[PDB]
Enzyme design. Structure first.
Site, PDB file in Angstrom:
ATOM      1  CG  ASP A   1      44.685  24.963  47.598  1.00 60.54           C
ATOM      2  OD1 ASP A   1      43.634  25.366  47.023  1.00 60.54           O
ATOM      3  OD2 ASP A   1      45.174  25.535  48.609  1.00 60.54           O
TER       4      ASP A   1
ATOM      5  CG  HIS B   1      42.545  27.348  49.973  1.00 60.91           C
ATOM      6  ND1 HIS B   1      43.861  27.683  49.733  1.00 60.91           N
ATOM      7  CD2 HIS B   1      41.967  28.441  50.517  1.00 60.91           C
ATOM      8  CE1 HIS B   1      44.068  28.931  50.116  1.00 60.91           C
ATOM      9  NE2 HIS B   1      42.935  29.412  50.593  1.00 60.91           N
TER      10      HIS B   1
ATOM     11  CE1 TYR C   1      41.167  37.595  53.554  1.00 63.42           C
ATOM     12  CE2 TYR C   1      42.300  35.508  53.934  1.00 63.42           C
ATOM     13  CZ  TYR C   1      41.475  36.307  53.157  1.00 63.42           C
ATOM     14  OH  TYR C   1      40.974  35.814  51.981  1.00 63.42           O
TER      15      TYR C   1
ATOM     16  CB  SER D   1      43.848  32.482  51.935  1.00 64.49           C
ATOM     17  OG  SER D   1      43.222  31.277  52.305  1.00 64.49           O
ATOM     18  CE1 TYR D   2      46.164  40.394  50.849  1.00 64.35           C
ATOM     19  CE2 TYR D   2      45.021  39.824  48.805  1.00 64.35           C
ATOM     20  CZ  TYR D   2      45.814  40.692  49.532  1.00 64.35           C
ATOM     21  OH  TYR D   2      46.265  41.850  48.936  1.00 64.35           O
TER      22      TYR D   2
HETATM   23  N1  LIG Z   1      38.565  33.533  46.707  1.00 63.46           N
HETATM   24  C1  LIG Z   1      38.277  34.465  47.518  1.00 63.46           C
HETATM   25  C2  LIG Z   1      36.783  34.396  47.889  1.00 63.46           C
HETATM   26  C3  LIG Z   1      36.264  35.518  48.897  1.00 63.46           C
HETATM   27  O1  LIG Z   1      37.055  36.383  49.308  1.00 63.46           O
HETATM   28  N2  LIG Z   1      34.908  35.476  49.318  1.00 63.46           N
HETATM   29  C4  LIG Z   1      33.839  34.979  48.373  1.00 63.46           C
HETATM   30  C5  LIG Z   1      33.279  36.110  47.519  1.00 63.46           C
HETATM   31  C6  LIG Z   1      32.683  37.229  48.380  1.00 63.46           C
HETATM   32  N3  LIG Z   1      33.416  37.493  49.616  1.00 63.46           N
HETATM   33  C7  LIG Z   1      33.706  37.229  50.847  1.00 63.46           C
HETATM   34  O2  LIG Z   1      33.409  37.724  51.911  1.00 63.46           O
HETATM   35  C8  LIG Z   1      34.660  35.959  50.758  1.00 63.46           C
HETATM   36  C9  LIG Z   1      35.096  35.509  52.217  1.00 63.46           C
HETATM   37  C10 LIG Z   1      36.600  35.389  52.499  1.00 63.46           C
HETATM   38  F1  LIG Z   1      37.183  34.512  51.706  1.00 63.46           F
HETATM   39  F2  LIG Z   1      36.782  35.013  53.749  1.00 63.46           F
HETATM   40  F3  LIG Z   1      37.207  36.550  52.340  1.00 63.46           F
HETATM   41  C11 LIG Z   1      39.072  34.076  48.853  1.00 63.46           C
HETATM   42  C12 LIG Z   1      40.544  33.848  48.686  1.00 63.46           C
HETATM   43  C13 LIG Z   1      41.420  34.957  48.531  1.00 63.46           C
HETATM   44  C14 LIG Z   1      42.811  34.726  48.366  1.00 63.46           C
HETATM   45  F4  LIG Z   1      43.608  35.760  48.221  1.00 63.46           F
HETATM   46  C15 LIG Z   1      43.357  33.405  48.345  1.00 63.46           C
HETATM   47  F5  LIG Z   1      44.660  33.241  48.186  1.00 63.46           F
HETATM   48  C16 LIG Z   1      42.509  32.270  48.500  1.00 63.46           C
HETATM   49  C17 LIG Z   1      41.112  32.516  48.668  1.00 63.46           C
HETATM   50  F6  LIG Z   1      40.309  31.480  48.819  1.00 63.46           F
END
Ligand SMILES: N[C@@H](CC(=O)N1CCCNC(=O)C1CC(F)(F)F)Cc1cc(F)c(F)cc1F
Ligand SMILES: *[C@@H]1O[C@H](CO)[C@@H](O[C@@H]2O[C@H](CO)[C@@H](O)[C@H](O)[C@H]2NC(C)=O)[C@H](O)[C@H]1NC(C)=O
Ligand SMILES: *[C@@H]1O[C@H](CO)[C@@H](O[C@@H]2O[C@H](CO)[C@@H](O)[C@H](O)[C@H]2NC(C)=O)[C@H](O)[C@H]1NC(C)=O
Ligand SMILES: *[C@@H]1O[C@H](CO)[C@@H](O[C@@H]2O[C@H](CO)[C@@H](O)[C@H](O)[C@H]2NC(C)=O)[C@H](O)[C@H]1NC(C)=O
Ligand SMILES: *[C@@H]1O[C@H](CO)[C@@H](O[C@@H]2O[C@H](CO)[C@@H](O)[C@H](O)[C@H]2NC(C)=O)[C@H](O)[C@H]1NC(C)=O
Ligand SMILES: *[C@@H]1O[C@H](CO)[C@@H](O[C@@H]2O[C@H](CO)[C@@H](O)[C@H](O)[C@H]2NC(C)=O)[C@H](O)[C@H]1NC(C)=O
Ligand SMILES: *[C@@H]1O[C@H](CO)[C@@H](O[C@@H]2O[C@H](CO)[C@@H](O)[C@H](O)[C@H]2NC(C)=O)[C@H](O)[C@H]1NC(C)=O
Ligand SMILES: *[C@@H]1O[C@H](CO)[C@@H](O[C@H]2O[C@H](CO)[C@@H](O)[C@H](O)[C@H]2NC(C)=O)[C@H](O)[C@H]1NC(C)=O
Ligand SMILES: *[C@@H]1O[C@H](CO)[C@@H](O[C@H]2O[C@H](CO)[C@@H](O)[C@H](O)[C@H]2NC(C)=O)[C@H](O)[C@H]1NC(C)=O
Ligand SMILES: *[C@H]1O[C@H](CO)[C@@H](O[C@@H]2O[C@H](CO)[C@@H](O)[C@H](O)[C@H]2NC(C)=O)[C@H](O)[C@H]1NC(C)=O
Ligand SMILES: N[C@@H](CC(=O)N1CCCNC(=O)C1CC(F)(F)F)Cc1cc(F)c(F)cc1F
Ligand SMILES: *[C@@H]1O[C@H](CO)[C@@H](O)[C@H](O)[C@H]1NC(C)=O
Ligand SMILES: *[C@@H]1O[C@H](CO)[C@@H](O)[C@H](O)[C@H]1NC(C)=O
Ligand SMILES: *[C@@H]1O[C@H](CO)[C@@H](O)[C@H](O)[C@H]1NC(C)=O
Ligand SMILES: *[C@@H]1O[C@H](CO)[C@@H](O)[C@H](O)[C@H]1NC(C)=O
Ligand SMILES: *[C@@H]1O[C@H](CO)[C@@H](O)[C@H](O)[C@H]1NC(C)=O
Ligand SMILES: *[C@@H]1O[C@H](CO)[C@@H](O)[C@H](O)[C@H]1NC(C)=O
Ligand code: NA
EC number: 3.4.14.5
Lengths: 728, 728
Positions: B670, B702, B509, B592-593
């Site tokens: 998505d 997604h 990830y 995703s990431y």
């Molecule tokens: N969009 C981001 C949301 C996020 O990271 N969270 C919500 C806000 C607070 N944080 C968290 O812990 C998460 C959980 C998780 F997404 F798993 F990281 C996730 C995200 C990152 C990325 F690089 C993608 F290409 C797609 C995607 F959906």
């Protein structure tokens, strides 16, 4: 051991096929491009001269995409800034160069983003379409006269066609017709106000942050179609009036009762124009012949000159009603129509008599009328040796129909059985173009005595190169099913050995009036597969195929996705029953209509095929355009043919895809067969738990013809085929 | 000899983890749904009574999606007609059933297509959002009061979040916050007027003739962001004669100077509210503390009570500034912030005092504050045994910070190293949820003496079933890199033999503050890959990962696609050097990431990987949303960080893909990582002539989580990985 024809060879065009593209500028002179130089040739002696030195536009500051000389040789139209749109449409910039004064015109220039431009047939008048409106220039350096004011992007099209008329009816972007001496300019106007829009994303260069949404009026089966109107303006009066009047010529009563189409426009004389209309149910068309009424400046079409053309077994025409060819005085004309036996032949018409007289007949068909002189009518047909896949040029004496001469049959029977022709302005000379089964051959001939003047291009260079290569062979023959002959062709590997079992790939198209079995010489993907991969590549023209009579062509009428599909499966059975085919290694692939058929076959559960590739397939007829779909399927309503529309989809056979290896490919910017079609197939397969291979091509259209994508897709299909066949 | 954990087992959930999801309704009791019946439990003794029979709604008509009991136990909100939107958003229909009179309410009922609804924290008031406007109902059967009238689809959001605020800031659709006793209702209002819209196609069932175009206000990096306003309304003084009055609390001046966000709302007392604001350049936030003025009826936020939180090495907070935890009187509060050493610990603040005092410290971090009483603060940290991937519940004495007691560490050290907790209202009781390394264990405890009252669920059934399965093991350890230790985990096949060479798949990830190496027990795709295919599945937490201090987490600040990508390659390089890893068979995959990192690794030219799979990856940061991207990358302008935006793309590395096998997957619907991202990747590979594998999923978003698609994607990936590894 000589090298074989490899994939790289095909993708890189190492073995180049030479041609000879000439442009008749008069009854005995033509232009030809040699070394970026435009040369003029005297047909009679073959001697030439430089018409326009290549260094003429060195300092133009723009790459010239194409050129066009005015009929009187006084000016030349230079096209640059070419921006492709659909199959025939594109926009570009234009400049006019004055040949005599050798100066480039810089005043009252043609606007940028012009959709279409054409010289008048005589002189140097110009007509062009810009922003959906028509403009006329009597002289290259003078101001334009605006003809229409209703033009509106994606709504009203004046002088140019909308997406469906361009693709399915006129096979062109232009919708305007100059009369013979250029006095009148006729044109069509399309109204797409209520036509639904297809919408898809176009991603463009990596630098575009937000994808663009392409929106184009496109009527799917059963949807609201564009309406159309026809007008004629007298360009000679343009400089005498502030706003010249566009005289409308209304469609006949028999067409105005319901939805219809303008399907043909042909000028007969300086003051007589003919028009053919087709009902949305494409089995009834009407031709009006209209004369200019000098006293009222109006156009009238006498019903006594109206000709009806309908079909009881199918639609009218191979793809649409054929075009009339009028005699000089415009009082009679020749048209190809199917006779009582269902074969297309030339019928001779008096403009005010409904019964015509056939001047050719037989169990073969006329492909097209090429030229008409006061004494002779020339045409191409597949009569020679009863081969529907062959093409030859014929000459029939107008004063004695029993006098028919084949002008190309015996020229070189072993090398040339597929001819095309190009006549000079008054048919004094003609270039014959042979494209198979041997190497293409171009020759120039004299009409006065039908003597061969000289060879223009014989492809000796290539023949020389192909000597050190193990080239595959081609077999064109037939099998008999239900007392009827059905042709097929096979690309056989070099040193073919009938005692061996070769894997077989069925290359299929199979759409209505198609022909995949012919005498044409091609260097394509099948060449590589047969030469390098020792794979037999076959094609078969079954029910619904063309040039063999309506009994065969109209067999799929209102029934697409049946006989043409089954016959293809049957063809494979017959082939494996020939003894040299490895029944464990039989594949099938196709593009467009071919992809549909390939998919239908792979979903039939026949057990005959191991794998198959569909590129940009149709998946359900309601997703394709109205004009093409309804021509063969009628309307998708319960009162018409909806049950078959629902019964002939690829998705309903999803469960059977478990028995084969499928590769589905589609360009994302396909404006013709929408990505939607493959998106629905993939979803259906996922839904029933079927694994398969897929590949999308970003921003590619129906042709997936961009240089890189073209190489990428055939490379990808090669791996899949080699893998399915267990080839190293 | 016994069975292994197969792909079907993973896809069909053969082995189900049991949970124990309770809902505290007071300081002594909780609700638990068993056999579709809602029971009420007494924490002290474990005795229960049926709160609501499952059959109470037999003839309800609709299928109930969820339920919500008002805080006073008098009513129950019934949710049905659920229609999912984004990650947290959805619409539904609601019905209110009176528990006292055992009767459903039929008057003045909540509208259909309601976007959000919530009981007041005390009693039974209601607040719902419909058509982007806020409504309040003092009693279930009375007409509701309209609070806002500006609601406008895709433009003005009252009480609910827009796309980006939902996904990146609040992780909720709700933008409503009831005051403690329900007197006040605070809410945010979002304006997306100038926010560009992402557009893509939705195909729907095959019956839909024309694809639908979805349009969503979505700000990509650098684009115009939505603006926000904050309001508070008194719901005890609402009138049916006059329109409710909302009092606005504007953001501090330090925020109004430019773009900013509202990132946190937390009530302190019945009349004091705290809000945190974040500048668009996310390394500076401000907390305002506002008190209700009974005289004017306004909310005043004294500058002296303003608290600034900033960062000089990165952004503020893990994903956003943490939430404060106020004391009963609301005069002081606890909040997690990184200390001078860069470790996140609990700081104690006085509302009108600038300097806070750290009550915890050390080279480890506090995950979150879970409960607060006048004597103890309860929190979870990864301090135990110095394992950053472990989690335990601790309590610290507020009168003496040197007295820290671990409450979960020693309960069952072999089975439990990762806890989560749920306290009752006054923290009289707590439920501990252990989720690894052994099978999940849920227990109830009493705070007075930290007694272990009873076991709620020990998953002994699953345990018995897993005894007949050859389950893989998990190794959690670390490697050193430049004096720094980095953790990784390996899912090892049954009967692991370090004398043999196993192929290895790197599960990655690696986004900022991520953790893929922990003690959590999971039954997923990797379980099957290790147990049935004998493949080792490893994950590594390198630079950029979380819970280890800012020196590691902020290492990738303004430089995504660098160290976190290089660190994965190093981990793999190091694993390849271990005796049990076949360096000829190393793969990598991510979503995703993780899809982005996987792609960047495969295009690095390191030569360590044979193949990899990327699912819905980000391909160039300018395509991803602003709030998330800019947090780590700053603005994509030349005066800021544009150059790094341009050389941190997948596309630029296309050429390096020639030496690997790549499978690229993506859902067409998505809304998070737009298909555009993979579309540009594929086009780039095509451009340099690189062959690869692809798969699009029609109408999937997604998570590609619909049942059929989920089974299809993992089946397809399993085939790809087994083929890459030469595994039968
Ligand atoms: N969009 C981001 C949301 C996020 O990271 N969270 C919500 C806000 C607070 N944080 C968290 O812990 C998460 C959980 C998780 F997404 F798993 F990281 C996730 C995200 C990152 C990325 F690089 C993608 F290409 C797609 C995607 F959906
Ligand atoms: C092709 O050759 C013919 C004949 O050789 C050329 O005819 C010319 O005719 C004019 C008549 O005014 C004479 O003055 C020239 O001397 C003729 N040329 C020659 C070579 O005899 C004709 O011009 C040539 N055409 C081209 C395009 O080169
Ligand atoms: C193109 O066709 C549309 C109808 O589809 C015409 O628009 C109508 O025009 C009338 C008369 O001006 C109005 O009363 C209607 O409101 C219009 N209907 C719609 C659906 O727009 C339009 O005039 C036609 N355009 C041309 C140049 O013929
Ligand atoms: C040239 O003549 C045409 C046809 O009469 C004019 O088109 C009309 O324009 C008026 C308003 O300008 C409209 O109300 C009519 O519906 C139009 N008719 C058609 C067929 O388009 C055109 O405007 C004239 N141009 C000039 C410069 O006078
Ligand atoms: C092209 O044909 C048109 C139509 O016949 C000719 O125009 C007519 O010319 C005659 C002169 O013989 C006049 O009596 C008419 O008034 C014209 N009719 C119209 C509609 O304009 C025209 O002269 C021909 N052009 C050329 C170059 O010969
Ligand atoms: C919730 O808190 C509010 C605010 O403290 C309480 O309302 C106040 O109650 C006092 C005592 O009756 C009144 O004199 C004030 O005028 C009220 N202030 C406001 C702003 O309304 C309310 O009583 C509390 N609710 C409950 C259920 O205890
Ligand atoms: C928050 O981050 C920004 C951006 O990194 C810092 O602002 C300046 O940003 C520009 C452009 O990147 C640099 O040239 C400057 O060096 C940065 N600092 C200053 C003082 O201008 C900003 O300093 C950071 N804020 C804090 C509190 O660290
Ligand atoms: C759990 O058990 C106790 C018995 O000790 C129940 O009894 C308490 O509440 C009852 C009504 O709710 C009363 O009838 C009892 O007098 C009262 N006893 C005590 C010591 O408080 C309690 O209700 C039970 N709770 C549940 C949810 O069933
Ligand atoms: C929502 O934000 C918009 C845009 O910031 C506000 O309107 C402003 O922007 C419009 C379009 O760009 C302009 O046409 C207006 O002049 C400008 N100001 C006003 C008062 O419209 C809009 O008012 C905001 N709406 C709400 C409810 O806050
Ligand atoms: C939301 O929609 C439902 C269903 O349409 C409404 O319930 C009734 O549904 C019947 C048919 O099922 C309709 O004929 C009625 O018009 C609907 N309304 C009533 C009062 O019966 C429901 O009422 C709608 N929600 C609200 C608040 O009106
Ligand atoms: N749209 C049709 C146009 C057509 O058939 N021609 C133009 C009109 C006259 N006829 C022709 O000969 C052709 C040429 C050809 F397409 F090759 F048939 C072709 C076509 C058919 C189909 F089933 C598809 F899914 C996609 C497609 F592009
Ligand atoms: C004309 O230009 C082309 C390309 O620049 C070149 O091949 C050719 O030599 C030129 N013409 C002549 C007669 O050389
Ligand atoms: C066409 O576009 C070019 C480039 O913008 C411009 O310089 C030129 O003047 C334009 N010509 C006309 C006729 O508008
Ligand atoms: C035209 O086709 C329709 C549909 O089959 C049919 O009902 C009608 O009779 C046909 N007309 C002719 C002349 O065959
Ligand atoms: C409630 O219904 C469920 C199935 O929906 C059933 O398993 C259960 O037995 C019912 N409750 C009781 C107390 O019987
Ligand atoms: C409340 O405000 C709205 C929004 O402008 C208005 O339409 C409505 O009439 C108002 N109602 C009262 C009672 O003022
Ligand atoms: C320390 O290790 C990092 C990677 O962890 C490396 O990039 C760096 O160059 C090394 N040296 C220094 C002085 O940071
Ligand atoms: Na106990």
């Amino acid at each position: 051991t000589r090298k074989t024809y490899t994939l790289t060879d095909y993708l890189k065009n190492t073995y180049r096929l030479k041609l000879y593209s000439l442009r008749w500028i008069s009854d005995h002179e033509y232009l030809y491009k040699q070394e970026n130089n435009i040369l003029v040739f005297n047909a009679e002696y073959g001697n030439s001269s430089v018409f326009l030195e290549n260094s003429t536009f060195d300092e133009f500051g723009h790459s010239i995409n194409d050129y066009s000389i005015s009929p009187d040789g006084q000016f030349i139209l230079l096209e640059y800034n070419y921006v492709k749109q659909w199959r025939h449409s594109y926009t570009a910039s234009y400049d006019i160069y004055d040949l005599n004064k050798r100066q480039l015109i810089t005043e009252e220039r043609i606007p940028n983003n012009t959709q279409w431009v054409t010289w008048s047939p005589v002189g140097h008048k110009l007509a062009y379409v810009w922003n959906n409106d028509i403009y006329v220039k009597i002289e290259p350096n003078l101001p334009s006269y605006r003809i229409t004011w209703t033009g509106k992007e994606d709504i009203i099209y004046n002088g140019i066609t909308d997406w469906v008329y361009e693709e399915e009816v006129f096979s062109a972007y232009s919708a305007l017709w100059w009369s013979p001496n250029g006095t009148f300019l006729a044109y069509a106007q399309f109204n797409d106000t209520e036509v639904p829009l297809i919408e898809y994303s176009f991603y463009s260069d990596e630098s575009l942050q937000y994808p663009k949404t392409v929106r184009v009026p496109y009527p799917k089966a059963g949807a609201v179609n564009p309406t159309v109107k026809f007008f004629v303006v007298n360009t000679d009066s343009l400089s005498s009036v502030t706003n010249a009047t566009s005289i409308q010529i209304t469609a006949p009563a028999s067409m105005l009762i319901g939805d219809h189409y303008l399907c043909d426009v042909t000028w007969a004389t300086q003051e007589r124009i003919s028009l053919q209309w087709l009902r949305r149910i494409q089995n009834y068309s009407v031709m009006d012949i209209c004369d200019y009424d000098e006293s009222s400046g109006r156009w009238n079409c006498l019903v006594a000159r109206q000709h009806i053309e309908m079909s009881t077994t199918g639609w009218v025409g191979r793809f649409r009603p054929s075009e009339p060819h009028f005699t000089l005085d415009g009082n009679s004309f020749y048209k190809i129509i199917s006779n009582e036996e269902g074969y297309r032949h030339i019928c001779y018409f008096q403009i005010d008599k409904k019964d015509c007289t056939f001047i050719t007949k037989g169990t073969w068909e006329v492909i097209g009328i090429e030229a008409l002189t006061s004494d002779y009518l020339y045409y191409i047909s597949n009569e020679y040796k009863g081969m529907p896949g062959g093409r030859n040029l014929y000459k029939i004496q107008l004063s004695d129909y029993t006098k028919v001469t084949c002008l190309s049959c015996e020229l070189n029977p072993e090398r040339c059985q597929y001819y095309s022709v190009s006549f000079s302005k008054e048919a004094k000379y003609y270039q014959l173009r042979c494209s198979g089964p041997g190497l293409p051959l171009y020759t120039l001939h004299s009409s006065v005595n039908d003597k061969g003047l000289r060879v223009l291009e014989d492809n000796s260079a290539l023949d020389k190169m192909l000597q050190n290569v193990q080239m595959p062979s081609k077999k064109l023959d037939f099998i008999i099913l239900n007392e009827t002959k059905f042709w097929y062709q096979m690309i056989l590997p070099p040193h073919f050995d009938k005692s061996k079992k070769y894997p077989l790939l069925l290359d299929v198209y199979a759409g209505p009036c198609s022909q995949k079995a012919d005498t044409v010489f091609r260097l394509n993907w099948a060449t590589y597969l047969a030469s390098t991969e020792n794979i037999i590549v076959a094609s078969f023209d079954g029910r619904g195929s063309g040039y063999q009579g309506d009994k065969i062509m109209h067999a799929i009428n209102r029934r697409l996705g049946t006989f043409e599909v089954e016959d293809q499966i049957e063809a494979a059975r017959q082939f494996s029953k020939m003894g040299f085919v490895d029944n464990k290694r039989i594949a099938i692939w196709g593009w467009s209509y071919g992809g549909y058929v390939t998919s239908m076959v792979l979903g039939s559960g026949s057990g005959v095929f191991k794998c198959g590739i569909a590129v940009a397939p149709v998946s359900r007829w309601e997703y394709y355009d109205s004009v093409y779909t309804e021509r063969y399927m009628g309307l998708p309503t319960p009162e018409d043919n909806l049950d078959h529309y629902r019964n002939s989809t690829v998705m309903s056979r999803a469960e059977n895809f478990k028995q084969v290896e499928y590769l589905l490919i589609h360009g994302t910017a396909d404006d013709n067969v929408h990505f939607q079609q493959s998106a629905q197939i993939s979803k259906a397969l996922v839904d029933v738990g079927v694994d398969f291979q897929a590949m999308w091509y970003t921003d590619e259209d129906h042709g997936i013809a961009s240089s890189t994508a073209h190489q990428h897709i055939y490379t990808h299909m090669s791996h899949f085929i080699k893998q399915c066949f267990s080839l190293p």
